[PDB]
């Protein structure tokens, strides 16, 4: 029995967090929840929720209402340097892209999210993109370690070293150096514009992608759009001290916040991702298979996935299907 700190978040968050916990219980997952709340105190997260995660090393997070962003703080607090996004086509939910199986691995501390801008003169602004040896090395080693540990064969570094020679070239140089150590994973490099160009044409030619902050920010949502959007897309932030927080990236959805209608898929699939990170492969698989089969059946689809059924119904059917192993 393992403890996970749960951050139910805002709007539809409490609901879908309730749905996930329920499905986990229906699956007899070795997981008990330590419900916390993050709200910025005058800037840091509440004292008694930081220690909660320092304890558990492992957390799950619903959508957070924003303005000081709550994600920025959590990132900085726990040094969450790797943002990981596995995008896989959902068989029950057809898009024009049916063969997507991609992992975007995003550097999450520096790059063009340096925080630093200056008004040089009136009507002339400078935004600093920041790249370092250490953070680039860190993310490269993470991407190859992830490749190895999740049965992956190709890693592609995405860059614009042609245009941003010093910054991106440095990022690229650390990837290339890590590549020499992990020869059992195949490595290539591709210009960002070429990745976009090919991605919308044939997503299957890519496997694992590693990149600096803005590129991966953009590219991770591109990939989400291939498989049905943010409402179905899992995400995890891996940090310092073996800490990880898995999250839904969709909106807070205030319009339908307490009137059922919310779709728990994305969070559930983040929770499945959490489970795999913890080594609980059997439970992850069952909950995943259950979620998938529910979507494919297409009876209890929520209003966003084109259905008419409410959150309660969608959750109930997942619960029902999981119990059959």
């Amino acid at each position: 029995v393992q403890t996970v700190t749960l951050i139910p978040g805002d709007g539809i968050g409490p609901e879908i967090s309730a749905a996930v916990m329920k499905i986990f219980d229906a699956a007899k997952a070795p997981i008990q929840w330590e419900e916390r709340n993050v709200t910025a105190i005058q800037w840091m997260i509440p004292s008694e929720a930081k220690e909660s995660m320092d304890k558990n090393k492992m957390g799950l997070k619903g959508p957070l209402k924003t303005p000081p962003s709550m994600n920025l703080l959590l990132r900085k607090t726990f040094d969450l340097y790797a943002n990981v996004r596995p995008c896989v086509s959902i068989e029950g939910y057809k898009t024009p892209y049916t063969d997507v199986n991609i992992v975007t691995i995003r550097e999450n501390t520096e790059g063009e999210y340096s925080g630093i801008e200056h008004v040089i003169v009136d009507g002339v602004v400078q935004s600093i993109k920041l790249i370092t040896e250490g953070a680039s090395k860190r993310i490269a080693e993470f991407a190859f370690e992830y490749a190895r540990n999740n049965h992956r064969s190709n890693v592609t570094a995405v860059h614009k070293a042609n245009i941003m020679r010093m910054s991106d070239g440095l990022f690229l140089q650390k990837c290339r150096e890590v590549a020499e150590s992990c020869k059992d994973i195949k490595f290539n490099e591709m210009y960002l514009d070429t990745v976009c160009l090919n991605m919308v044409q044939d997503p299957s030619q890519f496997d694992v992608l590693v990149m600096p902050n803005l590129y991966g920010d953009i590219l991770s949502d591109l990939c989400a759009g291939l498989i049905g959007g943010l409402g179905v897309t899992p995400s995890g932030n891996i940090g310092a001290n073996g800490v990880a927080i898995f999250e839904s990236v969709h909106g807070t959805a205030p319009d339908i916040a307490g009137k059922d209608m919310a779709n728990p898929t994305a969070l559930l699939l983040s929770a499945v991702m959490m489970l795999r990170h913890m080594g609980l492969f059997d439970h992850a698989a069952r909950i995943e298979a259950a979620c998938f089969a529910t979507i494919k059946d297409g009876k209890s689809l929520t209003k966003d996935l084109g259905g008419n059924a409410k959150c309660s119904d969608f959750t109930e059917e997942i619960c029902r299907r999981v119990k059959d192993l």
């Binding site: 600093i128 010093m166 960002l192």
Partner: protein, 333 residues
């Protein structure tokens, strides 16, 4: 009879320029091409010469120059040096679904206006201490205003309703902020045009699912690189869409995606459509409209017959077969 600069460039550039010339001779086009080459040397002689040639002729057609990113930072992109020195501030491409080229999306008709001279392309980097590199994205009022001015003027001259500014001003609040401000400042002078904004993240997500919502899109340099490529891909890839670079006094025509095509060079499989269409846009700019529409009709007609399709759009035909078929729709006018 006009004199135009021609930079063959690298990869597939040289072979495609040859087909361009062939097509031009056969269509009796009154254009003389004045070739200037740009080699691989760190020495900027070739590139400054090319710039000077375009200053005289004021119009060019170019292939894509290879940028070797294993070279030192001081060795900069010759493509970028060129358009920044000539102040070709507006990069414009038109992505339109081609009825003969079936993809995963249809009814795409998008005009992309990209700031072509500042932003992330300013080549301003430095290493304060060992392994701590800063790159400097630059956004100015003067350049943001003219790109926005160009985007709104184009929209109203083309009979188009909506301009969408794409940005990341929720993160780069001052930088992308100012770009937005300048778009808004221009929007005030075009009440008929619907003005919207959208975060580049969301934009790409929207493009891969409902790209029909976009009409005219205006944006900073890097996001332009991204959106241009997503849009080319949606309509069938890099062999299809032409690209323009406009300054106040000069114009340079090329393929939208700016690809060298080194890996398919000299194998007679490069798709010629994009380059031909770029050369037609050049004719239209030189006010040789009759020859433009004549060549344009032929290349668009060659596109219908799926037997003339090159591998990059599913077919198996060669470059030279496509040229023959294009030349044939010409010799029957």
């Amino acid at each position: 009879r006009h004199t135009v600069t021609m930079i063959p460039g690298d990869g597939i550039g040289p072979e495609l320029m040859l087909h361009v010339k062939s097509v031009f001779r056969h269509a009796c086009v009154p254009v003389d091409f004045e070739e200037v080459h740009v080699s691989s040397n760190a020495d900027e002689e070739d590139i400054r010469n090319a710039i000077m040639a375009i200053r005289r002729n004021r119009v060019a057609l170019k292939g894509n120059i290879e940028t070797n990113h294993n070279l030192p930072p001081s060795h900069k992109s010759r493509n970028n040096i060129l358009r920044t020195s000539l102040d070709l501030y507006a990069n414009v491409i038109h992505c339109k679904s081609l009825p003969g080229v079936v993809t995963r999306h249809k009814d795409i008709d998008i005009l992309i206006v990209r700031e072509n001279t500042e932003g992330e392309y300013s080549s301003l980097e430095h290493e304060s201490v060992a392994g701590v590199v800063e790159s400097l994205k630059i956004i100015t009022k003067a350049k943001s205003l003219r790109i926005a001015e160009y985007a709104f003027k184009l929209a109203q001259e083309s009979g188009r309703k909506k301009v969408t500014a794409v940005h990341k001003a929720n993160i780069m609040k001052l930088g992308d902020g100012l770009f937005l401000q300048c778009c808004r400042e221009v929007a005030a002078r075009y009440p008929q045009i619907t003005f919207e904004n959208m975060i580049v993240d969301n934009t790409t997500m929207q493009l891969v699912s409902r790209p029909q919502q976009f009409d005219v899109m205006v944006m900073p340099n890097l996001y332009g690189n991204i959106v241009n490529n997503v849009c080319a891909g949606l309509v069938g890839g890099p062999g299809l869409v032409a690209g323009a670079n406009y300054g106040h006094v000069y114009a340079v025509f090329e393929t939208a995606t700016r690809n060298t095509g080194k890996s398919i060079a000299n194998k007679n499989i490069a798709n010629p459509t994009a380059t031909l269409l770029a050369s037609c846009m050049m004719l239209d700019h030189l006010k040789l409209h009759s020859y433009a529409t004549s060549i344009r009709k032929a290349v668009l007609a060659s596109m219908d017959n799926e037997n003339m399709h090159t591998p990059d759009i599913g077919g198996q035909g060669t470059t030279s077969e496509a040229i023959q078929d294009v030349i044939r729709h010409i010799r029957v006018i």
